[PDB]
Each structure stands twice: as C-alpha cells, then as structure tokens.
Design an enzyme around this catalytic site. Sequence first.
Site, PDB file in Angstrom:
ATOM      1  N   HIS A   1       4.098  -3.450   7.598  1.00  0.00           N
ATOM      2  CA  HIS A   1       4.946  -4.489   7.012  1.00  0.00           C
ATOM      3  C   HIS A   1       6.329  -3.959   6.648  1.00  0.00           C
ATOM      4  CE1 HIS A   1       3.285  -3.052   3.022  1.00  0.00           C
ATOM      5  NE2 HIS A   1       4.534  -3.282   2.655  1.00  0.00           N
TER       6      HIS A   1
ATOM      7  N   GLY B   1       7.986  -0.135  -3.714  1.00  0.00           N
ATOM      8  CA  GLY B   1       8.500   0.965  -2.928  1.00  0.00           C
ATOM      9  C   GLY B   1       7.549   2.130  -2.760  1.00  0.00           C
TER      10      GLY B   1
ATOM     11  N   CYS C   1       4.534   1.840  -1.294  1.00  0.00           N
ATOM     12  CA  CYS C   1       3.699   1.661  -0.112  1.00  0.00           C
ATOM     13  C   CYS C   1       3.944   2.803   0.856  1.00  0.00           C
ATOM     14  CB  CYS C   1       3.994   0.324   0.583  1.00  0.00           C
ATOM     15  SG  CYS C   1       3.723  -1.122  -0.432  1.00  0.00           S
TER      16      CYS C   1
END
EC number: 3.4.19.12
Lengths: 306, 306
Positions: A41, A143, A145
């Site tokens: 993503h 942030g 991920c």
Amino acid sequence: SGFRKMAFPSGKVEGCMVQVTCGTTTLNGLWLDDVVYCPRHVICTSEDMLNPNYEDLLIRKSNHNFLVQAGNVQLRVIGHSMQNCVLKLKVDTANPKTPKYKFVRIQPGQTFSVLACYNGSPSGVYQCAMRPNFTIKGSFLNGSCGSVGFNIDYDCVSFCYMHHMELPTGVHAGTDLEGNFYGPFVDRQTAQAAGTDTTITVNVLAWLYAAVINGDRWFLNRFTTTLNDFNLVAMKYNYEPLTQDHVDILGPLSAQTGIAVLDMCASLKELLQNGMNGRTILGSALLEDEFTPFDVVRQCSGVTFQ
Amino acid sequence: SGFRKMAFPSGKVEGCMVQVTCGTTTLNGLWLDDVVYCPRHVICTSEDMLNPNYEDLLIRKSNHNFLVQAGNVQLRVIGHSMQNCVLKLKVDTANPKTPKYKFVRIQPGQTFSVLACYNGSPSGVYQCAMRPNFTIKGSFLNGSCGSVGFNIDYDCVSFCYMHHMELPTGVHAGTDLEGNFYGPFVDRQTAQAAGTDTTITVNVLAWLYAAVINGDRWFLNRFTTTLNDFNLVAMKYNYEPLTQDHVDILGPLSAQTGIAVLDMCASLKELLQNGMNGRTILGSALLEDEFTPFDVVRQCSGVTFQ
C-alpha cells in the site's frame, strides 16, 4: 536471578532498514541483498486505501516513481514486482550488511522481537507474542508500516513479520515476508473483525516454572488433576486447551524443578477459579502469556548469539 | 496506538562488547577506542571475593595475565590501570566500531536499556529504571558482570551503568563508567543492605498521561488537590514526594491532553487510597513507574536515532 521480558539484540536488523517513497506516502522497507521488501500500500494515497485496485494502481507506476534511501545514500530501483501483499523492489546494489537470514511463517502463540522504525530509522525494540486471533498488541505510529519482526538463531536472522495495518479497534495486523497476511485480514481501510482472543495456556505454564526457578512458590497447591479435567476449566476462562504436544514441550522445565506438568496444571486451575487475591508472581498481578517454554530456557540458561 | 516497554536499538553497543579473562574467571568488557573497561573483580577468584585487597591482588598480576577476545580475534594488553572499581586495560588496537559516546552518571528514577551479555556475546536487551535505593531489578546470570546500560541521544551513545554484583537478596548493583558505585555498595561478597525502596511518583503520573493519550480514561476523577496535600497521602504509601521541578517536567503532557498536573494527582490519590478494584490501565493491574516523562513523549511522538 531475576526475570525480564527480553528482546533479541537488534544490530543485524538495523543495517537492513531503508526508507521507501512513492509519491507522498513514505514507509519502511527491508533491504536484503539486492531486493527491497515493503508493504504494497505504499503506492496508495489515503483516498485509495478505502477501495484499492492494486493491479490497476501498480500499472500506473514506474520504476522511477520509487525513491529508496538508506541514511543519506540513495538507491536506484531497477525493477518492481508484486508478491501477494508485499512489493519487491529490485535495486542496483547488494546490501553489504546483509546477514545470514531466513523467511519463516510462525504459529500463533509464538513470540518475536519488533524493531519499530520511522522514515527508515530505528526507534526501539520490544518483545511480543502472536495472539491466537492472529493480531499483535504493539506500539505503532503513522509511518511505522514496514517495520519487521524477527527471531535470532545463533548466527541466522529469521524474519517472520512485516507490519501493515492498524485496525479500527487499535490492534495490529501484518504479513509474513512472502506477503501472506496472518489471519483473515486484507490491506483495505474497512471495518474488519478479529476473532475472540484467548490466553496461551502453555506459555502461562512456562512462566509459572520460571517463577519457581526464581523462588516464587506460594501458588504450588495441594491438588493434582487430569488433562481432560483441566481443559474443562480452561475452556470456561477463555484459555486455549492443552495437548500432549504441549506436555512434551514442557518436559525440560519439569525435570529441572521436580514438578510434574499435570501438578502445575492443578496450581493453575486453582489460580483461575479463585484469583491471585492481591498477591503477585514475578512482579505481576496478572497471569503472563508472552513467554514460550523456549524463551524461559533461553533466559534461565543464558544462550548467546552472533 | 498502543504502549510497550521499549528498549533502545542495541546495534551501536553490540560492536563494543568483548570477553576478558584473567585466570579462571571470565566476564564482559567494553571496548572503546583503545581501552577496555571491565569490573576489577575479574582478578579475584571465589575465595578472594570474601575479603579482597585489590591493590595487593593487582600487583600480583601482569599485562600478559589478561586475555581480551572479540569474537575470534585476540587483543594484546599493552597496559593496565585501576580506576576506582573499574579496570582499564589498554590494548594495541583501536576498536573500528567505536561510536560517538559519552560517560554519564544518572539519577535515581531515570531509565536506560541493558544489553545482557555472556562470554562477550549479547543475549538480549531490556529497559529498566534505577530504583530510588540505587539498585536495579534485572536479569543477570553468572558471567554477565560487565554488561552495560545505556541511552541513545540521536547519534551519541551515553553509557551510564556497568553491572558488578548480585546482592544476597537477588537485586543488582553496579557502577558508572568511572567505576563509582551507585548507592552504598562495595564489590565484596558480604551481606549488604539496600535502603527502603519507594515508588517513583513522577513516572507513574507520566504513565497515566500515556493511558489517557491511548484512550484509558476511567480513572479521571471528580476531585482536585494541592501539592502539599498530595504528598501527605503519597508518603503513607511509600511514594516519593512531588516537587515543583516534577510539575514543570510534566508540562508538555498536560498541554497535549488538557489535564492539569494537580488534577491528575487527584486521580492518583484516589487510586492509592482505594485501589484499582480488579480493573486495568494499559494492560496492567499495578501502577507502573519505569517510564519517565521523556520516555512517554519519545514513544508517543516517534523520535528516531542514528
């Protein structure tokens, strides 16, 4: 003596964390020899996350649309590939800090260490368990991920988890390093239900043995019990059932302490039906389930790694 | 979201750990540029530890009596010096992994990360606080002496602790990196009393603010109170008194949450006098005092380091 929730040393993982940028969104990636792994993503904006068509979005992007940075050094993307929920970005340089590594899929109830990162830079390390409902109770901000979970065999780093999503309930969900989610989750901003969570009974028993080894013995009761009878009580309090495989795994701890596994189950049964009544075990007022039997043997015997 | 007891990434410290041998006893040392630091009782056997004369023992030893090893590479000792409870072993090679570092003496109630090591090799990392009685509640086995505690400023490693002794009560004692003990302890195998331990009140308050930030708000009470009146209650339950300096330190958390510091003290006062009554805060059934106000701001804002 003493007992702490100990994480693995993070040095071999720190040298592999990079920052990945595709448009506005920036997250963390894992740089092993000539490939960078990150959540797919990264190609989505906030609007796309509500209903993303990843194949269609990926086709709109090119190799030059990905900016990979390690500290103050930029990496050039030479190719891109989607493996199920992970993006594989092939770059031109092999990471000279690449450790001996392995990709593994862990089972619920196993533990591992998380290196929490922001903008490709490490912030802290902590130890956690994979819950029986395939979530993790972590600490992740926006942030983070792309942060990874890992175990260390003596000289080998086993990567087992990449963080993808915070569910609306505040618990965390992610994939293995081949991009397959743990649990029933998808990488879309929609309401998603996790199953009933249960307590990991074999882990609680291992922690009781650690308590005995360190001198906490007040809970050792006067009774014994059978495995069928223990599981009946455990099912009432949302504990997972105990199997013979779990008894075999607890063998070494039983031999070190002189306490048979079924005898320790009798103490646990009484703990569940009557509580701890304002007393503690190893500093805790609750029963702890994020140490495996192997974690207890490692910490009580002082195994070291590369 | 979420809250975990997070340790600092250990990579910059791992490259500095060495094994030091002087006779039979082997422990860990810290290798910064051309000096190795380790506890002076490395020169003692078990018999000597009961009543050691360190000056007399050190004179019996020579430079060649010390074997310093890093992994599978041996270091040659070129000189030796005793600084109060630490031995400084000058070797012939500067450590090429030496980070930007600093030696600091911390105050009780401050937190830091410990890299637990055996035979010069890291086993795990965990976060702990210096107790008000200058002990630490750690996890150390035989051979872990010389393990160090540290904090990380963005690019600078601040070494604050070296482990020396396990007291007969099972708590741990050590020095700063100039070799001065924290607390009244000496490096001798004799009975030694630590003072009454108290709970670190300013740390509990910071953790309550973290609970609010993460959505745990049931304890926010209907009362307020004064600082003199709060301290009267706190002294009864073995909490350390609150000062104006502590109020100033909590300022940022008060502004983020809309809750004045004295109002949060009113909630804490009621928690102490009436208990938590079978409910939890951030997953705990006890009040937690090993997060500083700076720890909470770091974790809730995601500061990163080199």
